[PDB]
């Protein structure tokens, strides 16, 4: 019919586009050719649409999808419509139970690739030869917040793994910070509860920033490692490109003769890593709150597709005890320094799902999951989390059938005599459910242990001891390892935990609480001690200021690799930049300013006062991408200002604003020709300053400086300049 | 033990305090003699705290609750420690499904009473006598966003009120604006899909702001009337108890001789109307994304009580067919200049939860849920609603037994032969459970119906017409209502309009849905459409120029029932203010603006740099409630900034910033003495402007020009000022 409009412009092209450029698609029809052996099974799955007839879920077609069956036209409903109940009763039952943490998330689909054989270290066959590439899904997610939470919050982000291998499911299940916050797996439930919206009300959301958080804090210094890496700038991503992954415990890869090393897996960025400051990311949960999720889905969509490299920390058995921290302690990392993370190989995400409840809500991760070639520790934490992922599932996936739930299916055979249970798919046929049988002469069979398509084993480790609910002495130490992190810091990444603290502890109603939580800080460091007691007017007793500092972790002093500027490393790509426009703008500007972002793989987005579109001086006709208040300099990374006929915006109050808020927010802004009109606004000195790129016409050096302070990512020379500006 | 500080201060006060001043709490414990029927039968199922042991499920003391059972303390958790497995089971199991619309939702305790008898028009109980109170429960929700969702988002808003009366529960479930989007029950599924997140990624929450909503409006003329109210500053108002409800079908009043009385109701907010403006609203879901949940609990905790007048507008059986709309059409209001709001009692929102889960995200409100005096008419979206509260339940609370989790049940008998069901409490005596029995001599009975405690009868209206499916001629019109809606609007409530619509419509990334729209904007009224046409850059083509407009209603031209702010209603009781503190504040300015404020109810939040406290010039000490930047303006209502040491925060971008964003959001700003060197910041003229209030000192008459400006709500006269601020 009609309804479509022809020209066609309903339907967006099946072929990378910028950012906004098109309406973005599920994956099938934004990407029909990208394929892998997980994508390709769940094709007897996929349900059309075109050319098809509207039908009831028994298949009898609907002639009437607009009125309720009743006895004349002004009459009652009758209880005879079955169309109308099936309709509605389908509506009705829509929603599952939501995780009981990590509920928010966002994931795409990809692969990994091993750069050479490990199997000297572990005879697990996904990295057995450089050759196997292997499907996965990825879940990122926050930690607090239900699933309507926002993305941009100060938290904790979840980075889950299911590798769809030949020889099983492996979940690499870990987060974006390498210790946890508690000692113990049975302390989970009061850990998040503390964290959690409070009982009685319901608040906050998506936020630490309230009494039991940090009640719970200082009565348990075991949290502060974990609790000073949220509050740095590593609590508030720019992306889930930008940020390292980790699985947290230390684990085992068994080779073929048996030999087991320790190791602990590492995620690192292609991209680099970068972050959002505070303001900014506050401001941004309420202007986006779907900035990383809709972010994620779009660098997909444009081939800016997310790498990370898998890293391997491994430790022999023997040097088990040569750390002045316990390997098994999941609250204290092992410093990069010290042993070195080897690059193993390489994931890339490059396609999105094409249905978000089906293929991302439903999906289940168990660090349990995992295959031959990979064993557990005795880490407290880790033989907890064990119990609980299989468990949730019989409530959030309704049953022991979660398996067959499509996006969770073995994409290799599985063969076992569990049967019936809440929809079940699998009709067997085996004349057996038990063995040992003879009547199928008992198959499937129990398969011995060896080096390739063996059956499961356990490392046979020693265990002796008395049954104890003891915690170990090596677990006791709470503060060098937050130290080493706080000596790490750039001084003005410092500056951000220092603020970071203060500003949740005024958000403590309770003063007492704040005050214990400076003690814990005064056995830390008593810089940052003083720095946060300031801010909340409190002062240190003289005791506290006589407290001795933490040792060394074995020697080490500061680690670089704890810090995320420190030693640089930045995508342009994928980046976006915020071009605003007038109503005559210099074409000779604009076409040298799109030329230089497009030959480095940096987004523009044209910006305006209204929608439609301008026409340049020389009569080209630019269509206009945003407003100046719909899309924020909260949402780009930089800001050029071409040359034009500057009188039309330069007294419209959103583009004065635009640029103070980015320059707060410590952004490179270029200004050319005219342009420059608007450092009377920022308040800049005539004869410049860093990171405001100015120049009489938008040419090759003023894009190549301004390209340069964007592989830096922000200006963190103004931070003393920033104080002064209302914004 | 310790833990807790003595001097007491972890507890509350049980008596009124004003917002911050205490943490809050459990209902109970904060206001233990709030008592009402309902509040005392729920009793039975508080559990306590002080003085217990921690236990088990199963009552079974734990001495190490801190500790998993391990073979040694550097072990393995054993598979036999069952209280680390019951505690981490309960927490795999705590979510249940949220509800699929109106999931976000805040609730509170309190009394409904008549003013006078009504039995001359209805037979219900609960409108007998002006001396029975009835025990209600309500809950104030959004429709789009989960319940991880922001609070003040644009959307409609729904208000459940569940009445606890001698003759059963009457939940009486409406909204916020007087008539829905659809006309009948089976279009509910379509609608809900087009506004909620869109299906292949889940963006965006809490916001129609999004194709398939208005590609969905410009197909569906009947939706229009009612994104009207939703595109005005009706869609973001300051606070639940600043809303007008309604019930949007027309039901039927029975009096006990049989007569029929058509009827809609009205829920009157005794505060007066008053909303937010969309910057600021939405600048708010970032700042506090709990803005209306925390400002509920604590005008509850400070006894500004929520009230609402119970009206009902009464239609004869004879007058069905007097006005040009059809009575049974929910999506067109009934002018209150043609029938007016007859008030007929009063609702008081006294007491807050002591568990949010347990009281509020368990509470099943059903419009089915009628008593003896009250009937259903053959509205068509009505009649299927009806089908539907039943249905939901039985996944959300897990079965047909819902009414037994303790804040649902009936406070009167109920007894019947239903047996067994998920988590069935009633343990039945009965010998039988089917009637007609003789064994139990058939008790319990059927009652015939009667003026007082008799059995539901249905009102036995005529039906004659056959069965179709078919919608009536007589909801065919689209337009004259919502020009009716505009006309009634003052100048800078449509300028809000447009505005809403405005923006909406630049983010639908398909430019031929925003054209649909404007074309039907056009049938309503031409400036209307001209406008929003203006800022999308489009134009209305000459034949879009001669539409003819669309008939009165009833001959009426406009009502002023209709806008928020043409007859004025103002509580400045409840109200907040923030006074902006240096550190040598003038405490004669203070203690006369302190005790102002006092005398009229309103809040005060004294606000620094840095938390603890400060010494007034007279060595009086005052203690900070928040930062500038932890409590921005956004929260307040109006700013006083005090003499004393100006210079000190002078210079200060924050405080600077405090002024110009509520300058722009139209609230008042009142300067003493040296105070008033931020005139230059807002750009104001020596000679002053209407909404600033300064002077020498603060008194008497600056507190008094501040108060009534107050009263009035946003200076409106100041929009054309505010385009040039950057803020
Ligand atoms: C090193 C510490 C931990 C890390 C790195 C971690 C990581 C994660 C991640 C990334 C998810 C999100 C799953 C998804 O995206 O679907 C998750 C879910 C969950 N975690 Fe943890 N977790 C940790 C500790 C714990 C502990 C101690 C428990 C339980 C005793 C626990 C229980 C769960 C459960 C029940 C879920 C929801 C499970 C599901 O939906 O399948 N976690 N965790
Ligand atoms: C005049 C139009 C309508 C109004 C005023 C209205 C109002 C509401 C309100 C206020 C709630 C929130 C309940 C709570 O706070 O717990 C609600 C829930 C709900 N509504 Fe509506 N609704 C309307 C139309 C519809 C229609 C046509 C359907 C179904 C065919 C529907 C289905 C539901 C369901 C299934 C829920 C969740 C029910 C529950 O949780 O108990 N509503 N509605």
Same mark, same amino acid.
């Given at each position: ?60 077609? $609907? ?13 009652? %409903? ?31 689909? /990809? ?15 996904? &990295? ?106 590593? /609590? ?69 597709? !997310? ?78 989390? &064990? ?56 198959? !499937? ?30 677990? *006791? ?6 130290? =080493?992190?706080?000596?790490?810091? %750039? ?35 008593? %810089? ?35 810090? &995320?500027?420190? $030693? ?43 929608? *439609? ?8 006709? =630019?269509?206009?991408?945003? %407003?100046?208040? *719909? ?97």
């Amino acid at each position: 019919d009609s309804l479509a409009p022809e020209d066609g412009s309903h339907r967006p092209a099946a072929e990378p586009t910028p950012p906004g450029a098109q309406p973005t698609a599920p994956g099938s029809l934004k990407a029909p050719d990208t394929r892998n052996e997980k994508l390709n099974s769940l094709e007897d799955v996929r349900k059309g649409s075109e050319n098809y007839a509207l039908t009831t879920n028994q298949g009898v077609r $609907i002639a009437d999808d607009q009125n309720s069956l009743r006895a004349g036209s002004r009459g009652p %409903t009758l209880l005879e419509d079955f169309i109308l109940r099936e309709k509605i009763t389908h509506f009705d039952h829509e929603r599952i139970p939501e995780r009981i943490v990590h509920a928010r998330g966002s994931a795409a689909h /990809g692969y990994f690739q091993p750069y050479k054989s490990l199997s000297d270290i572990t005879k697990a066959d996904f &990295l057995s030869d450089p050759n196997k590439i292997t499907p996965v899904f990825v879940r990122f997610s926050t930690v607090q917040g239900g699933a309507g939470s926002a993305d941009t919050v100060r938290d904790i982000r979840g980075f889950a793994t299911k590798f769809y291998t030949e020889e099983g499911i492996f979940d690499l299940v870990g987060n974006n910070t390498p210790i946890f916050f508690i000692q113990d797996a049975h302390k989970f439930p009061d850990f998040v509860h503390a964290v959690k919206p409070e009982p009685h009300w319901a608040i906050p959301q998506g936020q630490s920033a309230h009494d039991t958080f940090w009640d719970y804090v200082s009565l348990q210094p075991e949290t502060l490692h974990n609790v000073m890496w949220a509050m740095s700038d590593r /609590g508030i991503p720019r992306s889930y490109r930008t940020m390292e992954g980790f699985g947290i415990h230390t684990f085992r890869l068994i080779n073929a003769e048996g030999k087991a090393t320790f190791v602990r897996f590492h995620w690192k960025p292609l991209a680099g890593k970068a972050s959002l400051v505070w303001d900014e990311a506050q401001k941004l949960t309420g202007r986006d709150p779907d900035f990383h999720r809709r972010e994620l889905w779009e660098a997909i969509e444009a081939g800016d597709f !997310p790498e990370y490299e898998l890293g391997f920390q491994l430790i022999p058995e023997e040097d088990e005890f040569k750390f002045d921290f316990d390997l098994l302690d999941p609250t204290k990392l092992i410093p990069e320094e010290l042993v070195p993370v080897q690059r193993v190989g390489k994931m890339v995400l490059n396609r999105n799902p094409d249905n978000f409840f089906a293929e991302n809500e439903q999906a289940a991760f168990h660090p349990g999951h995992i295959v031959p070639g990979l064993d557990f520790t005795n880490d407290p934490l880790l033989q907890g989390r &064990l119990f609980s992922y299989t468990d949730t599932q019989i409530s959030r996936l309704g049953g022991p059938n979660f398996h067959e739930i499509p996006i969770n299916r073995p994409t290799c055979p599985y063969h076992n005599f569990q049967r019936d249970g809440m929809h079940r798919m699998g009709i067997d046929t085996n004349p057996a459910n038990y063995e040992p049988n003879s009547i199928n002469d008992n198959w !499937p069979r129990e398969t011995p242990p060896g080096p390739k398509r063996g059956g499961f084993e356990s490392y046979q480790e020693r265990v002796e001891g008395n049954k104890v609910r003891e915690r170990s002495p090596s677990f *006791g130490e709470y503060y060098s390892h937050p130290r =080493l992190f706080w000596l790490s810091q %750039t001084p003005f990444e410092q500056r951000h935990i220092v603020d970071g603290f203060s500003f949740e502890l005024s958000k403590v109603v309770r003063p007492y609480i704040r005050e214990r939580v400076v003690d814990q800080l005064a056995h830390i460091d008593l %810089t940052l001690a003083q720095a946060v007691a300031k801010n909340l007017g409190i002062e240190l007793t003289d005791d506290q200021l006589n407290i001795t500092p933490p040792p060394d972790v074995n020697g080490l002093k500061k680690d670089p690799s704890l810090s &995320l500027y420190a $030693i640089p490393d930045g995508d342009v790509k994928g980046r976006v930049v915020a071009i605003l426009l007038n109503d005559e703008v210099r074409s000779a500007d604009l076409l040298a300013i799109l030329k230089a972002l497009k030959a480095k793989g940096v987004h523009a987005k044209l910006l305006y006062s209204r929608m *439609g579109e301008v026409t340049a001086d020389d009569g080209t006709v =630019l269509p206009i991408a945003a %407003t100046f208040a *719909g899309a924020p300099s909260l949402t780009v990374d930089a800001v050029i200002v071409p040359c034009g006929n500057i009188a039309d915006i330069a007294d419209n109050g959103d583009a004065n604003y635009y640029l103070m808020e980015a320059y707060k927010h410590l952004k490179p802004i270029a200004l050319a020709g005219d342009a420059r009109k608007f450092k009377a606004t920022i308040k800049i000195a005539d004869q410049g300053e860093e990171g405001i790129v100015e120049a009489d016409s938008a040419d090759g050096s003023f894009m190549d400086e301004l390209l340069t302070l964007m592989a830096a990512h922000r200006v963190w020379s103004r931070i003393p300049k920033i104080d002064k500006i209302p914004a």
